[PDB]
Amino acid sequence: STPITGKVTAVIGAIVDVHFEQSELPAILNALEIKTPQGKLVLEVAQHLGENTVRTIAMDGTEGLVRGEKVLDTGGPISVPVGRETLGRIINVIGEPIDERGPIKSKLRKPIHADPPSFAEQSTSAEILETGIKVVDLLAPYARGGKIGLFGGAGVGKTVFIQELINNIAKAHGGFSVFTGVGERTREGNDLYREMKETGVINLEGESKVALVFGQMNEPPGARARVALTGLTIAEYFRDEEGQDVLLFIDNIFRFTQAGSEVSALLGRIPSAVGYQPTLATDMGLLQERITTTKKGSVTSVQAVYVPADDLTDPAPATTFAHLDATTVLSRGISELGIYPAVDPLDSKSRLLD
Amino acid sequence: TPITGKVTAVIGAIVDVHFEQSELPAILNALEIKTPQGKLVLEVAQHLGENTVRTIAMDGTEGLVRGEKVLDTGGPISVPVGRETLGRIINVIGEPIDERGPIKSKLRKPIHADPPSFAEQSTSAEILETGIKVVDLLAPYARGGKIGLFGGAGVGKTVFIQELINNIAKAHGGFSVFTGVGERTREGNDLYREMKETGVINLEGESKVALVFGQMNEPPGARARVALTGLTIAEYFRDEEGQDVLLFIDNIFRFTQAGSEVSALLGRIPSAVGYQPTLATDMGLLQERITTTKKGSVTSVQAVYVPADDLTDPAPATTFAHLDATTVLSRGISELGIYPAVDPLDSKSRLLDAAVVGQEHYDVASKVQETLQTYKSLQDIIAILGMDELSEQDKLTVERARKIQRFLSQPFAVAEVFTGIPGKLVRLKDTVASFKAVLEGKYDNIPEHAFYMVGGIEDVVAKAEKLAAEAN
Amino acid sequence: PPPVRLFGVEGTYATALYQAAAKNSSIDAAFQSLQKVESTVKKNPKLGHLLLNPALSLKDRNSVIDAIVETHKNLDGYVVNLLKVLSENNRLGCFEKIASDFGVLNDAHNGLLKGTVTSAEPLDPKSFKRIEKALSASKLVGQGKSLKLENVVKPEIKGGLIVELGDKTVDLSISTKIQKLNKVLED
Amino acid sequence: KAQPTEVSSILEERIKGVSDEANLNETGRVLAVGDGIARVFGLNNIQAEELVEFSSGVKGMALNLEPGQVGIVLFGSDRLVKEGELVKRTGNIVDVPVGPGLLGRVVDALGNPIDGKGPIDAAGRSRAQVKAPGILPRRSVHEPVQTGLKAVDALVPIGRGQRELIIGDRQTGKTAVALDTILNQKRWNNGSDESKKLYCVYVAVGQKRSTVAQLVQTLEQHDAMKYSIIVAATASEAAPLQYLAPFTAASIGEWFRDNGKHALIVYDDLSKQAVAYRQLSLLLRRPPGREAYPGDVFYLHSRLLERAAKLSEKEGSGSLTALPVIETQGGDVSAYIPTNVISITDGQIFLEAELFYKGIRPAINVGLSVSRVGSAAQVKALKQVAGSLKLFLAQYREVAAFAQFGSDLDASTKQTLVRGERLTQLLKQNQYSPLATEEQVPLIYAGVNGHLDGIELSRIGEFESSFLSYLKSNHNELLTEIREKGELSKELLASLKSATESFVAT
Amino acid sequence: TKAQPTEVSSILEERIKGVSDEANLNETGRVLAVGDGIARVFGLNNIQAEELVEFSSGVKGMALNLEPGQV
Amino acid sequence: VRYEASLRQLEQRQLAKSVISRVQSELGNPKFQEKVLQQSISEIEQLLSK
């Protein structure tokens, strides 16, 4: 209709400078398209240099961009298809499925940089979410709409633990699961998909109970700094529309902090202390404070933590631990005694064991 | 012929004045601006060219408009001097805030003067007996020199300075100029009441001190100059009257930190750890005007705050070479209750030579530092295994060392409300004989706790007798 | 004491030019010659524009300057000399910008206080005229000085109008008023 | 019903009345917005730190001025402020509504209430950047702030106008001390005398939304919201809000200070304010210092905490008392931030993690927690019957590592060891039960004079409530004596010793 | 690209005139900026590196950085 | 009392979506035309007043 067409003037790695013709400029955090022979290439405007010229971070590979290509605008932020049709469909951060099950016939398309809920709507007494596993609901109970730090490396039944959470939330509270691998290893991405088919939580013919968002490792860092927001918006539509209690799984939040570091070091902002980006607290808060409990429903998050170099004064776990309501450790010395699950009792402590 | 300019740039405490008269006001001159709150004083730091100066702001610059008229005063920031300023609380500019009227004094000298010449330098081996144990044993303070209290966050810099006030400034006879640089406003008020009650400040009468304050509330233009105001009042009495001048300065580190809050804004490249690059010269100009000439003596006591006990910080490490008698205060000593927490190891002085304080004094100090160095060396094996795995000379050495540490404590006349004990002013010779007695082994069977928080060895015997009559 | 500061962003070349020519009167001529050289750049667009590139030379920039002044003998006097400095300083690329800025300074000397009457759709002439009069019949302009006025079309606004000039504006339009109505009723 | 539409239509008349006088000697275009800060061309008559308003509702503070352009920091996400918009200037240095009408409300950093209880009945506006009161209208502190905790008023007392620091670690019980103090001030906020009331302003910075929601719910369970002021700057919102919000709350505190009344403020927690300040100074190219807090971060907490002291009689004998909270990293007291809050406040309450790991809550480390002008302003009774208690816990701390050898000892160390363990188990306290000084005196009095030594160690927790109910049922007149007089005379002391030895005997 | 260092208003003005003072400034120069014991100074085209100069008031200096525009 | 405050909040959010309905009612009008006259006379009132 009335397009906002400009020219790419500069490609620097994952940073892309887009010139627009005058009196047309979209604000920060708005989705821009570039049509390629391979598909579409999405940009998110992050800085305005003046001169009717914006500066974006990539969301896919930026090889082969002739400077001077047309830049199409979509006005709003990165749109994602939401709702019932998204279940069992591996959506990347763009909004397109990659399982080759055709396009997703979803009903709405939502922005991802939305407002967090206002203070009058925050639920004023955090009850206990009945998960279903015994040692969870006994010792370190998960806060309904709270945050849960699931530690421990792979191979201790962590995927078994998280599928068990999927089935038990499907039974007891009837809530759906939104899994999100930020920075997920691609091979174990496929192994997780195959195992979630064979365990029954993904039915390719019936009604599956989970939405997968896999932001792969080989995407540029602007992707991984929004994949968690994509999973968050798919959680928010199930919360505030259909009124449920939805489990948002995020692995692995330290790779999200790396995505923040590399986005705000590619933009030329001065790096902070240890080397994480100086927008650390705010760009953790814009992921944390949208996971809460309103009077309609709630989204409870289980998010892993890769503790860097086995150290807990490093600011990325020292910032995540200013938000986590309850920890859950899957240790080695408990599965070594052949115990399923391996919820270690002495370590997994809650702020809601009161 | 007033020289008018325009404010063309404000960044916090740094303001730019464009002139159109080709006579630009020189470096270190004072501009002023009529504000709706009164007036506000600027100090010209560097010419940018283009008929534009770039100045530091002696007070807060909330609410200037680009283009506001800037007025010249010709010279540097003038400060009232003389006997008129005694018992008065002079701010950085020179507006008193004791609200007892303006300071009807004769001269107003500028702050920025050069240090004295090398031929004007004077030396003095005048030993100042202070009455503290840990000073007068291990690091004797020098009259006419300078005295540093390197100290961490809350291990008794300010309490030790009030101790030296209460033990010197009454029996001094010269004058005293206290200078609150970036310390607490409340501590300034408490020192003001202590000066009123103890007759140092005599309000209606004649006083002996001059308060030059300006605290951590002030924006960093004031803290980079308030020590210069106290300095000018000090060296006036050093030069105009020919007296002895006590110059207590607390805290000298806030000066250099005000040196670090403007230099990132004045376009200087950031130096090492975050401070300015103009550090040794600015600390040099502030230290080398506190000296001792052939006209009078300045025996100054300067606190030094150290950020988080890292003595490789560039500002106190620069400060170490300017001081004739350091005194290190460490938090790891102060947690064990040893007050004051004077590090007996790293304390030095230009004094404490055998030909200066006497051979006996020097030998006692050397033996005490040998015993405490032996303790600090054997620290690790004590921490791992315990005291039982030593030899039988060294176990006696460790035990006598831990006697002498708890004996280094001294109940202060100012910290009386923390410990509940009245003050102890122990003279020098009793301390020398006391440490000689404990070194020679005359008291090796006394329990250790009786050495703690005591005056002299007579009170050690008395307190051991008290605990003997109590424990029985 | 020159009027309307450039201050910073490369208008200082113009500032120097202005003040150097302000003491020697000839500014309109300078201004006219700037108009003429800007037009003869515009009326020869291949390599009148596209030969304002930084990769040429010292010497070729100087000879373009000579080629530029070859078309007209005695190009004012001062603006023929300033180009040489810029040619040597290689700030030629940021040049017509300097033309626009000298124009702003010049018509500030005339006092043309350029305004604007933003809308989302162009308007009749009667409104234009009545507003221009009002703006001329205003405190704003102290008279003795002119008053341009430009209507622009803005879709980002929902209609109404806003008057602008002397970094002083009034907005009685629709979009802002919807905003304020919303804000007060969104509590 | 339509009554808020009536009120909003009156406000429409104000907006339409403001539109009749709207001539903004200011407006300028937004050249470039980047790094979460905006550069604006125009505005040739703006002030330093003047509030401006962009064309999307996001306000802003203009913190630097240059020849050519003005740099305005934002007050929210930069998603709203677009390039090329319109920048009216409001006209004010950054101010907030102050006055008594905020009691009960929950505002964010700019006086916008977010509780959902209508507009702020605002008794005026006041600057955020107020010069601190100079050294002449100050009086040294001489009135107690009865926190209601046992160990706090035993060991580290708080004066009205004494800036005390609550330093600690993560999830180690830091917020609970300030919350129990606010709930203890219910003893006088229900009362009638103004000079004994004590208004609480709790300033949550950097915390979660739901934590501040639960804390408002807690302060309405125990009815503190007739005197509370919540200033919330939750971590979803962007960084200059967190840089501003404790300062605006200090303006709220100064309003109660100048007007004779007494008021407590709680900053919680300034180690996230310095996070927000290092974010705002590492997006404006200002070069970092030690551990990348920028070089003036001492000055920030300085100019914050110095607007709190005790005014003398010359200004109206009002006060403002601050409790900043500092989150350290693993029991550290020597990073660059906690060695700047310590070098301002008049003492520490070092809530060490190891003692809370043994469940002793609140976990005040006694041998580290000290206060400098606390001792001159304690209640006279506790100062009479706890002048040994600090020295006795120092004595017990001396033999802490000496008894770990397991060696058989003399009688005196066993006596002090038993009494020290009884005192350590004695100072525990459940949540939301502050004990008034009228009941803090007899429990400490039973602790000092060896009366507990026959009791086993586990009974002490129920000994507390048993001995309290024994004094509430029978010796009520002694509690009224301690309430009125605030001091133990000899007859009071003998009656108290009888009333102890009675209940001690069984 | 970026403001250069021989572009102040008091120096370009003279160059616009055609007086070309820079060629005349071999033995003499002018102070441009002088703060923190450093004096960026325009002129002295014949100057060396590590050469002594005297300012007209009486304080002396060493010339270290020879840039194109200033000293 | 709690339920009364909740009912007031529900009344306010109903009138908020009614405000959205009023925006939809207003934006189809030739008040888009007629209101330019209002700005015209308003600028006459403002700029003449100084």
Ligand SMILES: Nc1ncnc2c1ncn2[C@@H]1O[C@H](COP(=O)(O)OP(=O)(O)OP(=O)(O)O)[C@@H](O)[C@H]1O
């Ligand atoms: N007296 C007490 N009784 C019961 N629980 C307590 C008590 N004191 C502290 N706690 C526990 O301490 C936990 C955290 O309290 P608090 O918020 O003070 O810690 P914190 O370190 O301040 O946490 P944050 O820093 O995130 O605010 C709470 O879960 C509370 O249950």
Ligand SMILES: Nc1ncnc2c1ncn2[C@@H]1O[C@H](COP(=O)(O)OP(=O)(O)O)[C@@H](O)[C@H]1O
């Ligand atoms: N003689 C002493 N006895 C006991 N405590 C002392 C003594 N001297 C100092 N202190 C402790 O030192 C603190 C004072 O340190 P100070 O130097 O005033 O802090 P700052 O580092 O802010 O200047 C007091 O809290 C007090 O507990």
